[PDB]
Amino acid sequence: TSITAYKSEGESAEFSFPLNLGEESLQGELRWKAEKAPSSQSWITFSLKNQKVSVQKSTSNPKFQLSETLPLTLQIPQVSLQFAGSGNLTLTLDRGILYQEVNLVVMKVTQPDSNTLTCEVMGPTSPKMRLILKQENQEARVSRQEKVIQVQAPEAGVWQCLLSEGEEVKMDSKIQV
């Protein structure tokens, strides 16, 4: 089921749904819940006929983009902490309602003044997930088990910011301070 896409702001998230591509025709719908402003209405309606995907009136916020053919890739295109959350991609009567869960977690690293270095993430994170601000190739300076960690008066250099679950680093992002 589930699929998670980890991205730094300003990047593209692209999900790929690669299931049982026979001669199928579908009606498909994707609806999204953006994490802090859960203003319901995000969706895209599309249809499949002969391997050509098509969109029946979609939404515009975020601008979901669908692949005009198989394989059915949905791409949210210039990610932002404000679009992180998750949604389900319902597929239809292929034979029944086939479904997929989809998520997007977003990281934002900033140097707000020069006392501050910040790293914040938004979206669906496990609680065995911690944020880490490190110097480019050195060791973790801060490793807090929160969603926004901060570092006081960072030494000039490449800092890196990482999201890890267990010994698994889900993602990272660098900044030159």
Contact 113, 41 (CB under 8 A): no
Q: How far apart are CA 46 and CA 57, in angstroms?
A: 8
> Residue 96: beta bridge partners?
none
Contacts of 158 (CB under 8 A, 6+ apart): 135, 136, 174, 175, 176, 177
Q: What is the side-by-side strand order in the sheet with 129-135? A: 140-144, 129-135, 158-165, 168-176
Question: What's the CA gap between 80 and 161, in Å, rounded?
Answer: 17
Instruction: Return the amino acid letter for 116.
Output: T
CATH of 107-177, one of 3.90.180.10, 2.60.40.10, 2.40.10.220, 4.10.91.20: 2.60.40.10
The helix/strand/coil state of 176 is strand
Please name the amino acid found at residue 134.
K
Answer positive or negative: Cα dihedral of 54, 62, 84, 160. positive
Amino acid, res. 167: E
* Cited resolution, angstroms: 2.8
Token pair recorded at residue 149: 């960690």
d(CA 61, CA 134): 34
Nearest CA to 19 among 65, 72, 62? 72
CB 163 within 8 A of CB 6: yes
Buried b (16+ CB within 10 A) or exposed e, 57-66: eeeeebebbb
Supply 158's token pair: 């490449």
Pairing of the two strands 129-135 and 140-144: antiparallel
Method: X-ray
The CATH architecture to which 1-106 belongs is Sandwich (2.60)
CA atoms within 13 A on the CB side of 81: 11
Tokens standing for residue 7: 């991205």
Give the pair of three-digit tokens for residue 166. Answer: 């267990």
Q: Which amino acid is at 161?
A: C
Q: Which residue has the tokens 């669906």?
A: 124
User: What token pair was written down for 76?
Assistant: 């949210």
Indicate where the chain has its CATH 2.60.40.10 domain(s).
Answer: 1-106, 107-177
